[PDB]
């Protein structure tokens, strides 16, 4: 059951992944792009190495990630959305060598219908 | 100089207003809807009454506001974006009886082009 987030090219898209803060307490989170049914889900960015600093924003290029471990909400920011950003992604909860899928996110990029010429 | 934030109906829209955190130090922020060239800019929501707690999210209906006074970025969330949310808005910095415009924001609402029948 995938969840679709739509954003316009050039805009910043914000993906939110709610989770049980008690079930996933003490686990860092990750955001990866799934290229096919058999993978890979290539790691894009993960939360801070120290779980106590999960609220600090981490960047990889135009993608950022921040975690609210109190309310149980993971937030992904796709800045300056491009057409090639479209595809399926995963919200992951990390423990040891394991990774639990929190949510499968489909990113749909909409063309910018506005002419910004002045 | 109007900045255009485009969102899809039914989703949340995040509007970001960067500012000089030194020039606007100690100043609460606000978000108002400008109904015309001569006003009013009707106040919708503002940050916490205590500037020290500007990071706390404040709500008015489906509109939320949070302020990063360190990095200098004001964030407004329009929950469940609807066509009647379209229009011009202002990000404001408050000091006494004055208010400085941080950014004029045009909210444009796109219809959901996807058939979520599944």
């Amino acid at each position, epitope marked *: 059951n*995938t969840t*679709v987030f*739509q954003g316009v090219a050039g805009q910043s898209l914000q993906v939110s992944c709610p989770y049980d803060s008690m079930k996933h307490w003490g686990r860092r989170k990750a955001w990866c792009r*799934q*290229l*096919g*049914e*058999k*993978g*890979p889900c290539q790691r894009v960015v993960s939360t801070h190495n120290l779980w106590l600093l999960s609220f600090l924003r981490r960047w990889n290029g135009s993608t950022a990630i921040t975690d609210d471990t109190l309310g149980g909400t993971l937030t992904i920011t796709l800045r300056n959305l491009q*057409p*090639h950003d*479209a*595809g*399926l992604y995963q919200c992951q909860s990390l423990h040891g060598s394991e990774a639990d899928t929190l949510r499968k996110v*489909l990113v*749909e*990029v*909409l*063309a910018d*219908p506005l002419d910004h010429r002045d | 100089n109007t900045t255009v934030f485009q969102g899809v109906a039914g989703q949340s829209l995040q509007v970001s207003c960067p500012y000089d955190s030194m020039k606007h130090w100690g100043r609460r922020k606000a978000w108002c809807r400008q109904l015309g060239e001569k006003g009013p800019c009707q106040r919708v929501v503002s940050t916490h009454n205590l500037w020290l707690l500007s990071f706390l999210r404040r709500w008015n209906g489906s509109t939320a506001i949070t302020d990063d006074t360190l990095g200098g970025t004001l964030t407004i969330t329009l929950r469940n974006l609807q066509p009647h949310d379209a229009g011009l808005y202002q990000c404001q910095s408050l000091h006494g009886s004055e208010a400085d415009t941080l950014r004029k924001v045009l909210v444009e609402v796109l219809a959901d*082009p*996807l*058939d*979520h*029948r*599944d």
Partner: single-chain antibody, 228 residues
Framework: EVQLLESGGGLVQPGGSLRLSCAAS????????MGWVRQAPGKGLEWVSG????????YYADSVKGRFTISRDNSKNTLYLQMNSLRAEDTAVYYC??????????????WGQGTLVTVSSDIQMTQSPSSLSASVGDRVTITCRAS??????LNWYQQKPGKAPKLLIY???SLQSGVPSRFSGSGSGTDFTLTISSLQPEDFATYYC?????????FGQGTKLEIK
């Protein structure tokens, strides 16, 4: 489960118009990019067009840019291809194909059965060799070279005689679901190889590579694998 069925082909005079249709079932149609691939009789696969779920993004091969219009009806689960100013070189079997989630860096994982169209009377992909003779049990390697770097975004397809194409490898090295493990791929940048570790009787077919780094997902000319 997943099904794609094309219709609307037939005989048409030069300069005439024609509209192809593709009915889809077994998946949430409005979440996937879709595309069209055609094959002239005795020639290789030629990528035609692709369209986004919102229809806001449409892509066209150079040889049909301006003449063809791709469109979709998500409520009807139907893909369309409007073809205008038809030339003799447009005679081909036209295939409907679904993309796995996304478009760039993706792959066509499900194909229709094709429909015949008869007109009466960027990055270059080169495969090597054009024809190869091998025996059952042999190890076979086929190469594909891109005119510029495509990173890891190369797909390998198989077409048995008389059948529609079928995806084998995506993203240079990922084995598609249900494909026998004797197939493997490798390479990055511009040089890529498809390997069949031990040839089987059903493997005698034609093999095509395809890049998906750009918006026009061009195929190689193909490698025919024949019996020694």
């Amino acid at each position: 489960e997943v099904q794609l069925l094309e219709s609307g082909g037939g005989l048409v005079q030069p300069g005439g118009s024609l509209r192809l249709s593709c009915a889809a079932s077994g998946f949430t149609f409005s979440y996937y990019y879709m595309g069209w691939v055609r094959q002239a009789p005795g020639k290789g696969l030629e990528w035609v067009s692709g369209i986004s779920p919102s229809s806001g993004y449409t892509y066209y091969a150079d040889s049909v840019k301006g003449r063809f219009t791709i469109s979709r009806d998500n409520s009807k689960n139907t893909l369309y291809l409007q073809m205008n100013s038809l030339r003799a070189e447009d005679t081909a079997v036209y295939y409907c194909a679904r993309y796995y989630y996304g478009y760039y860096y993706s792959h066509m994982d499900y194909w229709g059965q094709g429909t015949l169209v008869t007109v009466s009377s960027d990055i270059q992909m080169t495969q090597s060799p054009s024809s190869l003779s091998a025996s059952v049990g042999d190890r076979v390697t086929i190469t594909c070279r891109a005119s510029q770097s495509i990173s890891s975004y190369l797909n390998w397809y198989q077409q048995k005689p008389g059948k529609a194409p079928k995806l084998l490898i995506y993203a240079a090295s990922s084995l598609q679901s249900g494909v026998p493990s004797r197939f493997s791929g490798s390479g990055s940048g511009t040089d890529f190889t498809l390997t069949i570790s031990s040839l089987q009787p059903e493997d005698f077919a034609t093999y095509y590579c395809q890049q998906s780094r750009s918006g026009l997902h061009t195929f190689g000319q193909g490698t025919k694998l024949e019996i020694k």
